[PDB]
A paper describes a structure:
A few components involved in KAR-signaling have been identified in Arabidopsis thaliana, including an α/β hydrolase fold protein, KARRIKIN INSENSITIVE2/HYPOSENSITIVE TO LIGHT (hereafter referred to as KAI2), an F-box protein, MORE AXILLARY GROWTH2 (MAX2, also referred to as ORESARA9/PLEIOTROPIC PHOTO SIGNALING/KARRIKIN INSENSITIVE1), and SUPPRESSOR OF MAX2 1 (SMAX1)/SMAX1-LIKE2 (SMXL2). Crystallographic studies and biochemical analyses have demonstrated the role of KAI2 as a KAR receptor. The structure of KAI2 displayed a canonical compact α/β-hydrolase domain that contained an α/β ‘core’ domain and a ‘lid’ domain. A smoke-derived compound, karrikin (KAR), and an endogenous but as yet unidentified KARRIKIN INSENSITIVE2 (KAI2) ligand (KL) have been identified as chemical cues in higher plants that impact on multiple aspects of growth and development.
Recombinant proteins of KAI2 and KAI2ply2, purified from E. coli, were crystallized. Comparison of KAI2 and KAI2ply2 showed that there was little structural difference (r.m.s.d., 0.2 Å) in overall structure. However, in detail, we found that the residue A219 of KAI2 was bound to aromatic residues as Y124 and F134 of the lid domain by hydrophobic interactions, while the residue V219 of KAI2ply2 was bound to extended aromatic residues as Y124, F134, F157, F194, and H246 of the lid domain. The entrance of KAI2 presents an opened pocket and hydrophobic charge for the ligand, whereas the entrance of KAI2ply2 forms a closed pocket due to C-gamma 1 and C-gamma 2 of V219, which is a bulkier residue than alanine. The results showed that the amino acid residues of KAI2 ranging from 125–150 exhibited a higher B-factor than those of KAI2ply2, implying that this region, corresponding to the helical ‘lid’ domain, might be more rigid with lower motional amplitude in the KAI2ply2 protein. We found that the Tm of the KAI2ply2 protein was increased compared to that of the wild-type KAI2 under CD assay conditions; the Tm values of KAI2 and KAI2ply2 were calculated to be 45.23 °C and 49.36 °C, respectively. Thus, the Ala219 of KAI2 appears to be important in forming space for entry of the ligand as well as maintaining flexibility of the lid domain.
Residue numbers in the entry: 2 to 268
Amino acid sequence: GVVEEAHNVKVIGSGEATIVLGHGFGTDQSVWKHLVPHLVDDYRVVLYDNMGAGTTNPDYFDFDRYSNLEGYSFDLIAILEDLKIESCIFVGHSVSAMIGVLASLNRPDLFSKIVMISASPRYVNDVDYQGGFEQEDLNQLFEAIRSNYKAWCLGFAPLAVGGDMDSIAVQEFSRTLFNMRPDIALSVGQTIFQSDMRQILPFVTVPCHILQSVKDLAVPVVVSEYLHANLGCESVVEVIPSDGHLPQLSSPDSVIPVILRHIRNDI
């Protein structure tokens, strides 16, 4: 199947009860490796890769399509339609949380709940909003990515993942980051860092569970409070006593039980 192949779609199980898991920048569906084992006996589990991940064909990366997060939301809806899924719990890591939110505005019927891990609607600070970054900080980042990609990957992965600098998770994320084509990494990094989803949050109607590490390079804790205050749906927040932007990969013993409780239990 064309969509299946392009996004490396994997489907594990057959019930109606379905969970779809979307990954963040720099990684792939393997970020879910410590969560999936605990879902498959109860749910049909769907994994996919975002266009532009290093596991995808760079020929399919259309810079205009992906110039806004809406392109990735259309991909998500296409995957759901291709699989004939009528409803799912969507678990979105990092940018995928916002991708799922956008998809839910167009097709709320397809989602019963969104569980977000490491989400942010806006990374750039203004005089009334803390997102974590000044524009000049983002400018430096993009220049690094342009100048020497390998070296940028090696420096960034430990910061993003947190914990011990030579952990297996750091190594894995360095590998997946460097698997991206450099031009695509740069373009998508800019699209994400410059995004702004704040204005649409009041229109969300699907219930959201907002989870993050207490220490996350890209997500100040106040962002979780901001999502909770401004989302128009029912929501709950749980800050986890963990380090890292990919804590489901790097700190599973502390993080997986929290994600599971939010998947299995409704607000």
